[PDB]
Amino acid sequence: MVMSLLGHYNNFFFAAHLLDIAMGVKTLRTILSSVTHNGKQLVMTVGLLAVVVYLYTVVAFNFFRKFYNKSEDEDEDMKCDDMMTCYLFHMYVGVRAGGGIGDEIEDPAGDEYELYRVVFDITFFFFVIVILLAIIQGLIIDAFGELRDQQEQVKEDMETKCFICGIGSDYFDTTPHGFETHTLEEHNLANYMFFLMYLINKDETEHTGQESYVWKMYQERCWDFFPAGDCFRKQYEDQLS
Amino acid sequence: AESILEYFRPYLGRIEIMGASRRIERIYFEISETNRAQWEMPQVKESKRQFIFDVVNEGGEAEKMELFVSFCEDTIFEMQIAAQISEFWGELEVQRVKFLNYLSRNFYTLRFLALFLAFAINFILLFYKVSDSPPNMVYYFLEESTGYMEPALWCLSLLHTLVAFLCIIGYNCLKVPLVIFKREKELARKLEFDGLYITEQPGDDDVKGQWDRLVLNTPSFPSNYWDKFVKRKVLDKHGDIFGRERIAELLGMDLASLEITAHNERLLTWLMSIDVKYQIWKFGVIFTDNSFLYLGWYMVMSLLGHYNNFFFAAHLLDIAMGVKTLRTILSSVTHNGKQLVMTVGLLAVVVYLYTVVAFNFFRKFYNKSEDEDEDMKCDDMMTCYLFHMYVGVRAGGGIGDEIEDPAGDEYELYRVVFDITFFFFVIVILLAIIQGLIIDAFGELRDQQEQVKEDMETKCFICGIGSDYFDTTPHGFETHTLEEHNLANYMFFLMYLINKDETEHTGQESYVWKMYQERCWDFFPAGDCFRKQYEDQLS
Ligand SMILES: Nc1ncnc2c1ncn2[C@@H]1O[C@H](COP(=O)(O)OP(=O)(O)OP(=O)(O)O)[C@@H](O)[C@H]1O
Ligand SMILES: Nc1ncnc2c1ncn2[C@@H]1O[C@H](COP(=O)(O)OP(=O)(O)OP(=O)(O)O)[C@@H](O)[C@H]1O
Ligand SMILES: [Ca+2]
Ligand SMILES: [Ca+2]
């Protein structure tokens, strides 16, 4: 509401209300869940990117200072003199280069350190380009699998157990639609709610012998009246049906 | 009796063993307040948690109870090593141990402080400047209008090396006296119960098993182990089969005939009269610790910092060893190192196969030569190989984006085929494996936590019976694994036997005490739970 209020202070502030599609759309919010499922372990990864290039700056600040002379012609950049510029040259240009840092510096054809600089660059392309940005691209692929198997657990367990007595469906199905009739007539997750609406909306002097026993345990918050182990079929399976 | 049976619960231990009747029995005892208080501590709460990961994941089943009792003994020594450090001629020796106990008491504090100062020095070092003129070039430190910025560097440098040196002495008196006990105990078992140096011999490998040959004859072999009478026990076991005079010589034990008189007959001055063999043995054990070396190497760099340079920019890497979760991401990439080095090695062999081709057919193309004169980076074969590698794999669009145009009639088709394969093979394929060996590591390291989680919540971990049998009773598996078998009473029992009197054992405490001496683990339930036993008779 505040942004829609500052809109009367006519500006480009209504261009921030589009982000409600994240909170609005049903499925679009689910994709945003995966990326936000590993935020704690993804900030600490990009933080590992501002520490490796710092380790690669103090090296090129002492040996390769005569190379970063982005200086065009005339006069004479030298983006390496302070240490608050090469660090801002290996970061604004380094990780954004895509082909390592060796694609923005002088040619190593010179005899001095012709080998010490290639080793310095190739490692910079394998470590902080391939490896250290495949983790960021990899922490998302893992999130989808981490968020897809969750739906299977909340699906493969609702269709196997009674959710109230815990007995697996493999015992009920000794009768046609055994687990089908049990979890829809005996235990139903809706009758157990329609019962609480029944006690509270009744008269206290009208409870029966069983409606009052469960009413007392509900006051003391003792939950020892749910079946939790038996189903009245496992109880009388020996005597009769 | 409700007030009693309530005030005494955090002390009424329960264990469940079998033996001497071929049936499951039950035992009761007193845990005590002092032992109980030492069990819920962050230094111990984590050791148990990481231990279970080392059993249900990479451990066996027949040897599980063996390596469980061993850990249950490493903890007793740790509870003892910690319950003691808590709060000119002889007047100095009293303040030393009173100070070392303060050093090791708060060790993770010093270990964290050196991480803080490493961020201060590296914050300052972000100002240095180069100049070929005094304010052969000089490294003039630049300042933003503040003069005291450099004099603070001299202060924080020597301060950092201090705490980086006290962490060694703290580690030396706190976590070393346990890397020794783990090895002493391991050696006293391969002699008393095996013939590692009597019957058989080390297999000419595993120098760890060979370096211990020089500690047998030392005067004080079991310095930290409990049983200091291991020598007199090995003798009475192999003294007849092997040469009694020979065995009683390998273990030192001079005057074997006169080693009965000890039982028959009842300060900076001569400190130079101490053993040197055992001390060398202990030295060789500490120096091969992966944690002591990194902790020592971290001190050398902080020492060369006085040789003022950019060496404190290497202490930041302790965030790998410092942070809790950051070290876990580094585990995945290091989980496939053996099969990832051999993959990048496959990259230095394919481009070599692509060099000998362009060295015989496409030599007239690599003429990086600009204008004038006439590069020719292809003449030797120690340059095109260094042109297809420094530029080839780093190009991103194959090698065809740095060479002449194939518009010429000669080999207009033989070169495109040469390049397109170079873009599909050593760019897409051979660098999707490197990017793919990491994605697999996360899934390979995530399901591991599920196995150590879906098995702790399904089985008793002691009798192995699944929870599906216990849950025929409300909270069946919930009460069983918290009262009958508890993984803490079975430890609180060993503290109870060792800290008791031998003439006080009951009928059951003594039977389990004898099997513990012979290292026979046939008293754990392992199959029954006293409920499966009496389910027919009564409840
Ligand atoms: N009391 C219950 N005990 C065990 N399972 C239940 C119970 N009530 C519902 N279920 C589970 O839910 C499934 C059927 O209902 P479901 O949760 O699919 O919602 P629904 O009744 O189909 O209606 P909707 O899908 O519109 O929510 C069954 O597989 C069943 O296992
Ligand atoms: N003796 C035991 N036998 C089988 N399982 C056990 C035993 N002791 C603990 N557990 C397992 O551990 C779980 C509960 O303890 P857990 O390992 O989570 O540690 P905790 O007691 O919760 O304390 P913390 O989590 O602080 O270590 C239970 O699911 C149980 O299966
Ligand atoms: Ca009534
Ligand atoms: Ca007695």
From Swiss-Prot, chain B:
Motif Selectivity filter in this chain: 396-402
Residues that bind Ca(2+): 503
Binding site for caffeine: 226
Tissue-specific expression: Detected in skeletal muscle (at protein level). Fast- or slow-twitch skeletal muscle.
Stretches of the chain found on the membrane's Cytoplasmic side: 172-282, 324-338, 443-539
Regions crossing the membrane: 107-127, 151-171, 283-305, 307-323, 339-359, 422-442
Intramembrane region ranges (chain numbering): 382-401
Phosphoserine PTM positions: 369
Highest taxon listed in the record's lineage: Eukaryota
Chain sites annotated for binding ATP: 45-49, 456-461, 481-487
Residue numbers on the Lumenal membrane side: 306, 360-381, 402-421
Cellular location(s): Sarcoplasmic reticulum membrane
Modification type Phosphotyrosine: residues: 366
Post-translational modification: The N-terminus is blocked.
Protein family (similarity comment): Belongs to the ryanodine receptor (TC 1.A.3.1) family. RYR1 subfamily.
Assembly behavior: Homotetramer. Can also form heterotetramers with RYR2. Identified in a complex composed of RYR1, PDE4D, PKA, FKBP1A and protein phosphatase 1 (PP1). Repeated very high-level exercise decreases interaction with PDE4D and protein phosphatase 1 (PP1). Interacts with CALM; CALM with bound calcium inhibits the RYR1 channel activity. Interacts with S100A1. Interacts with FKBP1A; this stabilizes the closed conformation of the channel. Interacts with CACNA1S; interaction with CACNA1S is important for activation of the RYR1 channel. Interacts with CACNB1.
Record's function text: Cytosolic calcium-activated calcium channel that mediates the release of Ca(2+) from the sarcoplasmic reticulum into the cytosol and thereby plays a key role in triggering muscle contraction following depolarization of T-tubules. Repeated very high-level exercise increases the open probability of the channel and leads to Ca(2+) leaking into the cytoplasm. Can also mediate the release of Ca(2+) from intracellular stores in neurons, and may thereby promote prolonged Ca(2+) signaling in the brain. Required for normal embryonic development of muscle fibers and skeletal muscle.
Domain notes: The calcium release channel activity resides in the C-terminal region while the remaining part of the protein constitutes the 'foot' structure spanning the junctional gap between the sarcoplasmic reticulum (SR) and the T-tubule. Pore opening is mediated via the cytoplasmic calcium-binding domains that mediate a small rotation of the channel-forming transmembrane regions that then leads to channel opening.
Miscellaneous comment in the UniProt entry for this protein: Binding of [3H]ryanodine indicates that the heterozygous channel is activated by Ca(2+) concentrations 4-fold lower than normal. Single-cell analysis of cotransfected cells shows a significantly increased resting cytoplasmic Ca(2+) level and a significantly reduced luminal Ca(2+) level.
Protein name according to UniProt: Ryanodine receptor 1
Species annotation: Oryctolagus cuniculus (Rabbit)
Residues of the full protein shown: 4167 to 5037 of 5037
